[PDB]
Automatic annotation (TrEMBL), chain B:
Belongs to the eukaryotic ribosomal protein eL27 family. One of its GO terms (molecular function) is structural constituent of ribosome. CDD domains: KOW_RPL27. GO terms for cellular component: ribonucleoprotein complex; ribosome. Keywords: Ribonucleoprotein, Ribosomal protein. This is 60S ribosomal protein L27. GO terms for biological process: translation. The keyword Ribonucleoprotein applies. The keyword Manganese does not apply.
Automatic annotation (TrEMBL), chain C:
Mg(2+) binds at residue 172. Residues 1-68 form the Large ribosomal subunit protein uL2 RNA-binding domain. One of its GO terms (molecular function) is structural constituent of ribosome. It comes from Chaetomium thermophilum (strain DSM 1495 / CBS 144.50 / IMI 039719). GO terms for cellular component: cytosolic large ribosomal subunit. Keywords: Metal-binding, Ribonucleoprotein, Ribosomal protein. It comes from the Eukaryota. Belongs to the universal ribosomal protein uL2 family. This is 60S ribosomal protein L2-like protein. GO terms for biological process: cytoplasmic translation. Residues 74-191 form the Large ribosomal subunit protein uL2 C-terminal domain.
Automatic annotation (TrEMBL), chain E:
GO terms for cellular component: cytosolic large ribosomal subunit. PANTHER family: RIBOSOMAL PROTEIN L30. This is 60S ribosomal protein l30-like protein. Belongs to the eukaryotic ribosomal protein eL30 family. It comes from Chaetomium thermophilum (strain DSM 1495 / CBS 144.50 / IMI 039719).
From TrEMBL, chain F:
Zn(2+) binds at residues 44, 46-47, 81, 84. GO terms for molecular function: structural constituent of ribosome. GO terms for cellular component: ribonucleoprotein complex; ribosome. This is Ribosomal protein l34-like protein. The keyword Magnesium does not apply. Keywords: Metal-binding, Ribonucleoprotein, Ribosomal protein, Zinc. Belongs to the eukaryotic ribosomal protein eL34 family. Pfam families: Ribosomal_L34e.
Length: 91, 135, 191, 76, 95, 118
RNA sequence: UCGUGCCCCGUGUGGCGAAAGGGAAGCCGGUUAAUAUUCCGGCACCUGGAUGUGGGUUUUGCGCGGCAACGCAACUGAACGCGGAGACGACGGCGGGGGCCCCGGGCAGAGUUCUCUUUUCUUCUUAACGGUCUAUCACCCUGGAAACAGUUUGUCUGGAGAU
RNA sequence: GCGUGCGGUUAACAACCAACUUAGAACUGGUACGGACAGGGGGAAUCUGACUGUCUAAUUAAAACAUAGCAUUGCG
């Protein structure tokens, strides 16, 4: 049963701080509180412990990540061009 | 094919003898009533011979070349088998299932294992079996 | 805070080959927006091993082997002199001079881009996070990748308490009173 | 304080050199008897059902060891 | 193609899914093929490769994760390593 | 009956070193008893799990108990758990075997290079 | 012993700073006009030192048992190292234990009692220190789970092996 | 008193034990029934500061200050 129309997790803030600010903070709270799939063990147990720190409850691996998501698109693209540059250098 | 046969060298991974090297005297793949799982009767080294340098006396070398053996019924899950083999004629049927049911039979079997292992160590062969694992 | 976030001192192993370390912990440093990584290396001169504290790049994890030296590979978390990387590589904690253990590109989500190399004079042109162009000695080191914790400033603080919690461990002056709200003896803007 | 359950160990304790005194406590409501021997570190108590043989244990006890019966009132 | 071969082995042949059953199959020596997922821990991967080398069993390094290997086997659970004991009507052994 | 109690020491504040529990005496009186902090279970050096078989005491209490109560009869016993010891054994064996394999491969490549040069 | 030397090692520098932080160890009963975990009686503990007896180990020199988790009164261990404890936020509900509160019976004592009230009230206790048998988490063995299962108030767990 | 090989899910039955809530009905006193105590008056609007918070101890508690958000400047 859906209890709110649009505020979602931002409903804890009530009428304070402004609608646009609550909507802006909602994305970060949803991504920072979601559970993620571990790239090491495959279980859905990776959660944030501090800002930029993501640990898996099952295999106990701790990974340096984004502030509110596990990976940032800049770092994913950086990994891609790093692989490209390494292939160019080796070849 | 099967590799857990007689003369197979394994590493014990659990229990009091964890990290020790053993040789399989007898494989019991189908298990028994006492041990209803794939297991093995093995003989191994509890205390390894010490390192021998070129300036030691004969008495000190003889003191440091002593081997303390042990015998064990061990689960297959608590063994890490290796590609090395150790074939000793003196260890043929040195232990069996009811050896472990009587303390004096264990002592006589350990005496035989100690004698055979010390002969093989003094031969200079199979140095990997008599050096301890570092972990 | 326990230790500063610095590279290893530039020694013979980093100057001529590579030395391997293991990442043991990724920890939160109060007052800093980026996580730190505790890495253990061997001492080449004694039996005891040495624990270092690096700024953690994104994608680094516990139990990972990283490599510091001239002959280290081009992988995230490795520490290389700028002459050992190609153009277009982004790096973190870039030394201004070879041996000061890191000066440039240290905060969360930031990096320094290797624009080019001048091998005759042993110089490297780099682009800083502010957009500035700098020339450094080519023996200056850097850690491959982007500093972890990026996107921190996107979330609104939303609360005076959250600002207070941010600046209490940072020692920065908070709250800020406007100079125009003061008397003429307190501020030049006073009155 | 330590319970002794073996009569042989109680006899060796009573023959120890540091056994300074001993006493007999009779609990007739529970029908039991307690032999308490004071040694250096510990007081050792042996608990028995009251019987004739429980009385003759005092004869097997050493003679030089002073043995006293505990009275009904502990006068200060 | 390896997914189609795997589906054929699940339909016709005999497999065991999982680390302990795979090790038991390798110890028995009746295992015909071993499949190891990409994200299997390197220690377990080296252990499985050593067991398969000692039993002379071929090893296929599946490029997917354990989630993908379980989906390829047709299960709703992950699987880091598995053993094919009977090929059935598939030609997965001929490679 | 008087049910209220007092501290028996001169610290009046509810600090972590001022823990009390309520007892009833053979004199029929309600009283406090000052107690120490709870002992902490020793933990594995590799994974951090609580080690089975080891008592949880304050640190100086371990000097009063004998050696077999403070350890497990195994390598790294009382310092690392059995799963971590098994992992150490398997990893050590496999890595030294791989070192032998790599040394064989390097010798073969060196011999091939020497034959090509000669 | 060329007798009046040689070798090894690297880490730096000391002190003050908390009767609420950290920290070796004591409980009960009694006792004074006034002190008491301090006195008395009983029963204990900690730290350090010396050196015996018993028991243990060893002629297979430095214990044995359990597949294992691990157990047992012992059961060698310098340099140099690794690790654990000390040692840690706030808040929420849930479960275990002590003490308090509440209820019923019984013995003993007290009060009420024109009438009623098998009544109303009071004592009925068990310390430190030890022994023994047990107590959520977790870990081990067998085995291999879809017709998915186990399971909390709160949906987490399981082929990386659940029930 | 334990081991198997079975067989059956109407135990949907018996025995014993236990506590506080909730709903419904009749009867009955009444000047009162949250009987003392405890315990929002409410509504239509305007101006004003976003809000929580803070200051003139001993005449001013506020449209003052702070705040999150926004914008500018300097520094490799
Ligand atoms: Zn994981
Ligand atoms: Zn562990």
């Amino acid at each position: 049963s859906k209890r709110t129309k649009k505020v979602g997790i931002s409903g804890k803030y009530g009428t304070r701080y402004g609608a646009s600010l609550r909507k802006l903070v909602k994305k970060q709270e949803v991504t920072q509180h979601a559970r993620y799939t571990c790239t090491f063990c495959g279980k859905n147990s990776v959660r944030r412990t501090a800002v930029g720190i993501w640990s898996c409850k099952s295999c106990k691996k701790t990974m340096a990540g984004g502030a509110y998501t596990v990976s940032t698109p800049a770092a994913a693209a950086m990994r891609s061009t790093l692989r490209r540059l390494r292939e160019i250098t080796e070849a | 094919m099967k590799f857990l046969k007689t003369s197979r060298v394994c590493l014990v991974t659990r229990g009091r003898y964890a990290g020790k090297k053993v040789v399989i005297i007898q494989p019991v793949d189908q298990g028994t009533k006492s041990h209803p799982y794939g297991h093995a009767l093995v003989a191994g080294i509890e205390r390894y011979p010490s390192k021998i340098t070129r300036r030691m006396s004969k008495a000190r070398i003889e003191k440091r070349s002593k081997i303390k053996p042990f015998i064990k019924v061990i689960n297959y899950n608590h063994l890490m088998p290796t590609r090395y083999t150790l074939e000793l004629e003196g260890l043929k049927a040195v232990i069996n299932a009811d050896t472990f049911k009587e303390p004096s039979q264990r002592e006589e079997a350990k005496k035989t294992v100690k004698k055979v292992l010390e002969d093989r160590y003094n031969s200079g062969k199979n140095r990997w079996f008599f050096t301890p694992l570092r972990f | 805070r326990k230790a500063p976030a610095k590279f290893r001192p530039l020694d013979y192993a980093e100057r001529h080959g590579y030395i391997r370390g293991i990442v043991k912990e990724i920890i939160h440093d109060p007052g800093r927006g980026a996580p730190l990584a505790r890495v253990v290396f061997r001492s080449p001169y004694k039996y005891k091993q040495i624990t270092e504290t690096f700024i953690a790049n994104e994608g680094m994890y516990t139990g990972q082997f990283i490599y510091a030296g001239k002959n280290a590979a081009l992988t995230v978390g490795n520490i290389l002199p700028l002459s050992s990387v190609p153009e277009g590589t982004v790096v973190s904690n870039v030394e201004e001079k070879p041996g000061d253990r890191g000066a440039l590109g240290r905060t969360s989500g930031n990096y320094v881009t290797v624009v080019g190399h001048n091998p005759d004079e042993g110089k490297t042109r780099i682009k800083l996070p502010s957009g500035a162009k700098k020339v450094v000695p080519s023996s200056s080191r850097g850690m491959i990748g982007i500093v972890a914790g990026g996107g921190r400033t996107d979330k609104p603080l939303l609360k005076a308490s959250r600002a207070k919690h941010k600046f209490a461990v940072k020692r920065n002056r908070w709250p800020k009173t406007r100079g125009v709200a003061m008397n003429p003896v307190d501020h030049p803007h006073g009155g | 304080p330590q319970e002794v359950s073996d009569i042989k160990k109680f006899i060796e304790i009573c023959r120890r050199k540091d056994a300074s005194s001993a006493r007999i406590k009779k609990n007739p409501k529970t029908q039991q008897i307690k032999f308490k021997v004071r040694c250096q570190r510990f007081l050792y108590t042996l608990v028995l059902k009251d019987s004739d043989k429980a009385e003759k244990l005092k004869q097997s006890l050493p003679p030089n060891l002073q043995i006293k019966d505990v009275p009904k009132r502990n006068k200060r | 193609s390896i997914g189609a071969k795997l589906a054929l082995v699940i339909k016709s042949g005999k497999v065991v899914l999982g680390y302990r059953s795979t090790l038991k199959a390798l110890r028995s020596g009746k295992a015909k093929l071993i499949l190891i997922a990409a994200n299997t821990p390197p220690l377990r991967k080296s252990e499985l490769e050593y067991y398969s080398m000692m039993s002379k069993t071929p090893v296929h390094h599946y490029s997917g994760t354990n989630i993908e290997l379980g989906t390829a086997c047709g299960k709703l659970f992950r699987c880091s390593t598995m053993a094919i004991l009977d090929a059935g009507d598939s030609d997965i052994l001929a490679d | 009956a008087p049910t209220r109690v007092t501290y028996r020491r001169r610290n009046p504040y509810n600090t972590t070193s001022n823990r009390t529990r309520v007892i009833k005496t053979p004199g029929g009186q309600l009283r406090v008893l000052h107690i120490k902090k709870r002992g902490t279970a020793p933990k594995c050096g590799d994974c951090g799990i609580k080690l089975p078989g080891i008592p949880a005491l304050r640190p100086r209490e371990y000097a009063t108990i004998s050696k077999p109560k403070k350890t497990v009869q195994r390598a790294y016993g009382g310092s690392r758990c059995g799963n971590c010891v098994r992992d150490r054994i398997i990893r050590a064996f496999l890595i030294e075997e791989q070192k032998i394999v790599k040394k064989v491969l390097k010798e073969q490549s060196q011999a091939e290079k020497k034959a090509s040069k000669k």
